[model samples]
Target: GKVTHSIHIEKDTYGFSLSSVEEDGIRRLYVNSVKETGLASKKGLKAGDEILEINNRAADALNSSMMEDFFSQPSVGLLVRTYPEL
Candidate 1:
């Protein structure tokens, strides 16, 4: 099962932190942390949640430039897909 969340964040704001790793040429991004007072926390994004998409765009190929571009927008929608931490 997966859950999707739509989060709107301000441009240039430190809303959350992400940790990514590449495996077999595929990039995976996970929520590392969320600012206590930031939009991410308010919107229920938590550490370890996998970021599946941004504004309907797949994030499996996410890179620094693309990640930065998403946060640089005035407002953006996120599709976060979470799996239980084992």
Candidate 2:
């Protein structure tokens, strides 16, 4: 019998870029490319999206370990305010 998993992992590389801000207080993050080797890849997590919550914790309270843990898991949906960069 074959067992299926609800989550998956993937490898990705993003171009190096600096963060930008708008007069309206909106932030924007720009990336060039993303590669999915194992599972899934999301390139829509833009910059200005205020990180409302991370791992069910406040964004400010999130640390490196917490971030690592966030990325360590697969199939975890991310919430954010998406913005487009011109």
Candidate 3:
């Protein structure tokens, strides 16, 4: 049996385009732009909101290698945190 569903493929990639912020302790992650097909856009995530985590992990604390791992799973099941902006 074949089940067919209408799925919309996002033409744009999903991930944060980061800009460095000057803060004392915690690093600030802002939504510079949501890729057209990114989870953020599909889920109503807006620009200017601060992204605090990903998949229950702190986005700020991730090293280069770890960060790479985070973006690998580009889906809704992945968890993230944000401030009141959207």
Candidate 4:
């Protein structure tokens, strides 16, 4: 039970804000905020959405450097798999 979305982020845009926390021995990345004019907001990604994957790769498998690399890219094409907090 997971949902997938493709989010296109423009160059020089702060796509969204994310925060990670450990839950049940897993580090879970959550959407902290989305800029009003950013792709994430337009695509309906809300705060508290748990990011399970990025670009079809499991988020859990990525090191901190890898995560930073992804965020640092311009015109990022994200294949995100996640679940929302209700």
lDDT, candidates in the order shown? 0.76, 0.39, 0.50, 0.71
Give Cα distance to truth, residue 28, candidate 1, Å.
Answer: 0.9
Task: Candidate 1: list runs displaced more than 4 Å.
Answer: 10-14, 83-86
Per residue, candidate 3 scores C-alpha lDDT tens digits across 1-86 of: 22211212232346445444647777666568766666556765555555565455565675657656555644422233454342
TM-score of each: 0.76, 0.40, 0.58, 0.72
Q: How well is each residue in 1-86 modelled by candidate 4, as lDDT tens digits?
A: 66777676666655688787877887777788888877677777767677777655676776778877877876555556567446
Question: Per-residue alpha-carbon lDDT of model 2 for 1-86, expressed as tens digits?
Answer: 22211222244323112233345554332222334332323444433344444445544455557766666654343344434455
Cα deviation of 50, candidate 3, in Å:
0.5
Greater-TM-score candidate between 1 and 3: 1
Off by over 4 Å in 4: 1-4, 77-86
Give the better candidate number (2 or 3) by lDDT: 3
Task: Compute the lDDT for candidate 4.
Answer: 0.71
CA RMSD of all predictions = 2.9, 10.3, 9.9, 3.0
Worst window of 10 by summed lDDT in candidate 2: 1-10
| Cα lDDT tens digits for candidate 1, 1-86 | 66666666555475788898778687777899888888778777888888888767778756678778878778877878775445
Give the lowest summed-lDDT range of ten residues in model 1. 5-14
Best-to-worst ranking by lDDT? 1, 4, 3, 2
* Alpha-carbon lDDT of model 2: 0.39
Error of 1 at 17 (Å): 0.7
